């Protein structure tokens, strides 16, 4: 079952779905049940592309115990959530339809991703 889905507005990077086994999630002891990373390094879960001012590991999305998602900026050049730059190494709550934005040029072009959160997974407390 899918936790959330990530859509590109410009559309250079097709839709990506991110899932998690609900068995293995409840078996986890830690308050952070799963982590996805987004960055220039294709080792990441989501490749933001080989754009140099994008950090190799630029931000992470964390699945909380509550079933909610958190955004961790871990980047050199910053990460914007609904057009406001989040504090680096902080943990911000992701709401439905939120827009995560990173810088690509010094000219002020952007890469922009939108989170679509599957409510059926959250409610799936089986």
């Amino acid at each position: 079952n899918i936790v959330f889905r990530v859509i590109s507005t410009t559309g250079q990077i097709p839709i990506r779905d991110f899932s998690a086994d609900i068995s293995q999630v409840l078996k986890e002891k830690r308050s952070i049940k799963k982590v996805w990373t987004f960055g220039r390094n294709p080792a990441c879960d989501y490749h933001l592309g080989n754009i140099l001012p994008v950090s190799n590991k630029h931000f992470q999305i964390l699945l909380g115990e509550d079933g909610n998602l958190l955004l961790n900026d871990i980047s050199t050049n910053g990460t914007w959530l609904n057009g406001q730059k989040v504090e680096k190494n902080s943990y911000q709550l992701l709401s439905q339809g939120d827009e995560i934005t990173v810088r690509t040029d010094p000219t002020g072009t952007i890469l922009s991703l939108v989170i679509f959160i599957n409510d059926k997974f959250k409610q799936s407390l089986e």
């Binding site: 220039r40 140099l52 001012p53 050199t76 050049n77 010094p106």
Partner: peptide, 6 residues
């Protein structure tokens, strides 16, 4: 393989 600033 490092990352250029603003």
């Amino acid at each position: 393989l490092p990352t250029p600033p603003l």
